[PDB]
Every structure is written in C-alpha cells, then in structure tokens.
Structure 1
C-alpha cells in the first residue's frame, strides 16, 4: 500500500488528481449538481518518473479496489471482457492499463472500444492508462467520451531529488556526516528510479565491511559505480555539457524579450518542464493570423541555435529539432498570407536576424548563464 506521502517532486500532477480522489469517495456529491466526470485519463512521461506509482497512490488515498493489466503481455478480447466485469460488480473502483501503446491485434482494440461505451460513470468507475509514446496512439481512442484528459509527469529538479532521497532512507540508519542536500546537487539528470537504485548500492558498500551505518563516503563511491563499467544504469550531466545547455536556454529568453511580439518569460531551467520541451505534440493556436507576429515567433524559435553558433560554433540535436519546426511554420505561411524557394528564404532571413541580436546583447547573455550555473533554475 502506498499513498501521496511516497511521491516526490510531482506537485502539479498531484494537484490535478485531487479531484479524482474526492469523486471516488462519494459520487453522490457530484451527481446532485450535474457535474460530469471524464471516463478515461492518460498519464504521459519519460520512463522511470513514476506513472505506475501515481496510479497506485490514488487507490490508496481512497480505499477502493484496484484492477490492472499490462499491455506488454499481449484470447486477447476475452481478457478485456473479464477485467471490466470485475470492476462493475464492485461499483466504486479503478481500471488501470499499462503500456497502452502496445495494445492500442485488431480484435483486442475493438473490444476495448465496446467496453468504454458500455459502463455507467455515475456509479463511481474510472479508467486510467500510461505511456511514453503518446504520438503513435490510434486517433479513435482520443475521441470525446473515451480519453479526453491528459496529465504530464516531469523529471525532478534539485529540490525534487532531495525529497526522493529522504523517502527511501527513512528506514535506514545514517551517520551524522551524511548531507542529502550535497548529494542532490551532484546528480542532475537522474530520475526517481535512478535515485532509488543509488541508495541500495551505498548500503551494499557498508554491509560488505560489517558496519551498521551508512557514511558520506559510501554515497560518494556509489555514484561512480552506477554510471560506468560493464554494469551501468544511469546517465548524468557533466560540467562541460552543463555550460552548453545553459547557453541554449538563455538564448531563447533573450530573443523573446527583445522582439515586440514575443511572449513574456516566467522561468528558465536546466531540466525540461513542459510537454513541448519533452518532444510531444499530443494530437493538438491563435484566433488571428498576422505576418508580424508570425515572423517574431520564428525568430525567437531560432534563438537557441544562434547562441550555439556565435559562442561555440557547434550544433546539438535540440537545435536540429528547432530548425525542422520552423520550416513547417513557414510553409503554412506561404499558403495563407500569399514555393520551396520562397520557404527557404523566409527561414534564412529569420536566422540572420537572431544572430545579430545575440551579438548586440552578449554581455547580458553572459550574466544570466553565470547565475544559472550555480542555482540551476530562475523562477
């Protein structure tokens, strides 16, 4: 059994799931005012971030049964029928499906669509699913009445990493020299699964010497064992890679602040945070289409690639993704505001414009990077 006290660094996701817990505890409070709940909910995120753990914590905060199946184990149609019948017989309950992209071969998909349409939501039944490849899902699953809510689960930041370390050492004896805050600052790029495996390695080092406490030296030696060798499990960002990433992020922020139609900036960080930063389209944005605001959007989207070329003379894979998105936007501009030769010159002009802004504001760009290299995030 787990609850929300076993989860670290997922404040925004836990905020959205509070509604589900209340509904499962007393459906009648929603029915008496005509509030209609979605039938399915989708969790999307990178592997190891805790999508399966979040679902189990929902069923713990409300004492309801938990019926689950795994999509990687896929007779198929018969198994889906059995699972939904169990949930109906016990009215307020949960149905959970894992690796839904594996199963969502044509008979199994058809049966699932029949089951979603055939149960009554007012009883207190809800369906949940998880995936890390949302862009290959069948469009029939996402139509209204089937799966119309999405929640994004993100990698942790420095304060999120420190919380997870505390959760997994509360049943272990520690020495007085252990500083979990220093350990958190040395593991950027780790996820919750990586941090849980790191605590086990430090305990093996202490046990192999017969000691009954874990010291600060055990933790530091465990970091080197998990990132190198024939049996390695994790990747972290080195100090050299950190400097290049900081210049890329600060390049976006400076160009947006200078163009008149650019959007305001609220946060800069070394760790990705949104669904766009994670590389998802989610099968998905202005009422009015204008030339001046479309050109300002293109220039700011090439700000990260321009700072790399002016400062280092290099190019990363994130900058190559940015250039591909810009070409798609320009192609739609030509067909709406009044062909390949025309698209090519629009992108080239925007790139030159961004490079001049980077040269003229080089001093401010350097100042931002220095603060980022010590704090990792500016709110």
Structure 2
C-alpha cells in the first residue's frame, strides 16, 4: 500500500528534515547547477514501534520514485547486495533502503556494501537510507565521511501526538457520539504508535462480538485493560504511582540548574523523553561541547547533572535506572577534569562526592518550590517556553 506524510503523526521535527530529500529526488538538476552536495546516506534511530519504516515509505510516496528495499534480519549475502544497487542505477532517481542494519554491520557482506557506497554517482538522484534501534553497536567504518554521515532522531509521542494518531486509524470506522478521543489520549501515557493501532482493533472486536454496528466509549475503556495484562499482553503504560517519582526527577534538574550561577537556561519540562541524550544514545560524539575549559563552569555542570538523583534520595530514599546513568556520565567527566586541570582514582572519587552533597543541600532548601512545580506537571504533562518562563519567575 502507498502512504504519504498524511499518515504520520507527532513527527514534525523529523518530517522537517526530510523535506529536502523529497525536493532533491523530484528534480536533481536544481541542486547541481549551484554546486550543492547531498549526503550519500541517512540513518534513522529510535525506539521500536516509533515508525521508522513508515517514514521511509512515506518519503518514497511523496516523491513518485521506485523503492528498492532489503531487511537485515534475513541475512549469497554479497550477491544480494550487488543486485540491489545494480537495479537502482537502471532507474535514474531511486531509493535504497536497508532495514535493521545493526544485524549486518558476515564480513564479506559488509565489505560489499562499502564498495557499493563508493561506486555510485550521487548526481544521478540516488539516496541510501537505513534504520536501527541499537546505534551504539554499529561498526565505526560505516560512519566515516562519504558514507552514512547524517542522523535523524524519532521520538515517542506526547499527549497531542497520541490524539492525532488515534484520529488517523479511526477515519474509516463508525463511532458513536459519546466517544471522546482526547480523554483516551490522556489515559495512555507511554504508548507508541504501534500500541495505539492495536488498541483500536481490540475496541472493534468488542463491538462485533455483540453484533453492534458502532464503537462506543465503553468499548475503548475496556480495551485498555485487556492489552496491558494476561497471557498475551502487548503494551506497557505509566501508572499513577510511577508518575510521581518521574515528576520529581525531572523537576530536580530544573531547580538545581536555575540556582547555580553558571547553569544553562531551561526551556521545556515533560514526562516523556525527547532528546537523543534522554534516550540513552551517545551517537559516537564527544561529551565536551565547549571551546574553553574552566573549573567554575565544569563544577556547575556536574552539580546540575546530579539534581535528579538528589531529589529521589531526599524525598523517597530510592534510586531508579535513570539516576544510575547520570552518575556514570558524571564519573567520566570528572576523569577528564583531573588530567586537564591538574591515587588518580581517589581524586576522581572526591570530586563526584563533593558535587553530590552540594546538590542535596540545594534540594533541602527551596523544597517548597519543588513541590509546587510537581503539582502543575501532574495535570498538564508538559510545560514549554512562554508558559514556563512565567512560572519560573513567580517562584525563586
């Protein structure tokens, strides 16, 4: 089946980057006449079920061009790669898609792919795309310049994104007048596009088992309970008890960074992760992103990175998986500070311990402001620039 950008919801930022590829594929001549050089390969990274293959298919749908694809789980391998690239050259504008590239990047198959990437002319209108959910185990040879040197991140949907996906999959189904798609969206935090599609099918089965010809609000609410438990369960959602712990963790980062003189501005607070760092990806990039290395700005960065872990210990006396990654990142930052700013393992241990104590004292103070932010975050699920600026000014 053919799909376009109208079948995708909650991927505005990813779709923005992919518009240039469609323009290049529709008319390569406009890029060549001014010496604009397009990348040879593009990589999509994200959690399973977020719609990476759907975006690749929609890109080919928007620009009416052929679509040659292969899957890395099916891996004779060297000969299959040769056939795919030969077919794409016979048709001037085309797309080559490689799904699950982590399962193949056995040594002979990878070598053939490297030879093919260097052997085709980009000015003919040929692009190569790939997708994976384990970007940190890829062979470093694939990420060198001239081969797969562009990355795009696909994120889980938020409240507004979930409601848009539900409308897409119910546009050809009869619904009653008591169905409220916004209430259903508010009750499925943590779901992805694949879980929402399966939920709609379960609600239709409950109505057909009784011979009715319309889906009611009661069918949707009973479907949620059936997909999260039992011998055949498909989805996981965030319970009210787990939501309080997550709200305190996120609010701890914002409070500490707003107090330290060298802290960075805060633009958004949410219950759902958005950034690639928030998803646990390093992307083969250095941790340091500043031209100058100074002691004062490095200590403030360490203290703000431990704010989420300090809030859990002071309010609950617990520790989660997210707080364990924060302490691991801080330990490697303190290791580079000793060698650049002037027995070694004992010095690194002292730097981390001092910063942790500093963050805890800041949490004990201002404890009234931390509680106020959590209450608002538990009823809206997200606060962003303009509304967040006013809130942060009333407090502090």
TM-score (norm 2): 0.95
- Equivalent residue in structure 2 for 1:326, among 322, 330, 341: 330
CA–CA separation in structure 2 for the residues paired with 1:130 and 1:28: 28
SS in 1 for 2:130: strand
The superposition leaves residues 112-158 of structure 1 with CA deviations (integer Å, 9 ceiling, x where unpaired) of 00000000000000000000000000111000000111000000000
Shift of 1:190: 0.2
SS in 2 for 1:48: coil
CA–CA separation in structure 2 for the residues paired with 1:66 and 1:116: 17
CA–CA separation in structure 2 for the residues paired with 1:315 and 1:58: 42
What is aligned with 1:363?
368
The superposition leaves residues 73-94 of structure 1 with CA deviations (integer Å, 9 ceiling, x where unpaired) of 0000000000000000001010
What is aligned with 2:150?
149
Shift of 1:276: 0.0
CA–CA separation in structure 1 for the residues paired with 2:350 and 2:24: 55
CA–CA separation in structure 2 for the residues paired with 1:341 and 1:33: 58
CA–CA separation in structure 2 for the residues paired with 1:144 and 1:344: 38
Shift of 1:49: 0.2
SS in 2 for 1:159: helix
The superposition leaves residues 267-306 of structure 1 with CA deviations (integer Å, 9 ceiling, x where unpaired) of 0000000000000000011111111111000000000000
Shift of 1:5: 0.2
Q: CA RMSD in A?
A: 1.0
The superposition leaves residues 306-342 of structure 1 with CA deviations (integer Å, 9 ceiling, x where unpaired) of 0001111110010011111111111111111001111
What is aligned with 1:376?
381
Gaps of 5+ in 1: none
The superposition leaves residues 162-192 of structure 1 with CA deviations (integer Å, 9 ceiling, x where unpaired) of 0000000000000000000000000000000
CA–CA separation in structure 1 for the residues paired with 2:329 and 2:152: 24
CA–CA separation in structure 2 for the residues paired with 1:146 and 1:238: 43
SS in 1 for 2:128: strand
CA–CA separation in structure 2 for the residues paired with 1:231 and 1:107: 40
Shift of 1:100: 0.2
Shift of 1:352: 0.3
SS in 1 for 2:177: coil
What is aligned with 1:65?
66
CA–CA separation in structure 2 for the residues paired with 1:259 and 1:353: 10
The superposition leaves residues 196-230 of structure 1 with CA deviations (integer Å, 9 ceiling, x where unpaired) of 00000000000000000000000000000000011
CA–CA separation in structure 2 for the residues paired with 1:330 and 1:34: 45
CA–CA separation in structure 2 for the residues paired with 1:201 and 1:182: 18
What is aligned with 2:357?
352
CA–CA separation in structure 2 for the residues paired with 1:104 and 1:26: 32
CA–CA separation in structure 1 for the residues paired with 2:232 and 2:141: 42
CA–CA separation in structure 2 for the residues paired with 1:323 and 1:37: 40
CA–CA separation in structure 1 for the residues paired with 2:358 and 2:315: 16
SS in 2 for 1:111: helix
Shift of 1:67: 0.2
Gaps of 5+ in 2: 383-395
CA–CA separation in structure 2 for the residues paired with 1:180 and 1:10: 19
SS in 1 for 2:152: strand
CA–CA separation in structure 1 for the residues paired with 2:331 and 2:36: 43
What is aligned with 1:267?
268
TM-score (norm 1): 0.99
Runs of 4+ in 1 over 6 A off after TM superposition: none
CA–CA separation in structure 2 for the residues paired with 1:148 and 1:78: 25
Shift of 1:14: 0.2
Shift of 1:99: 0.3
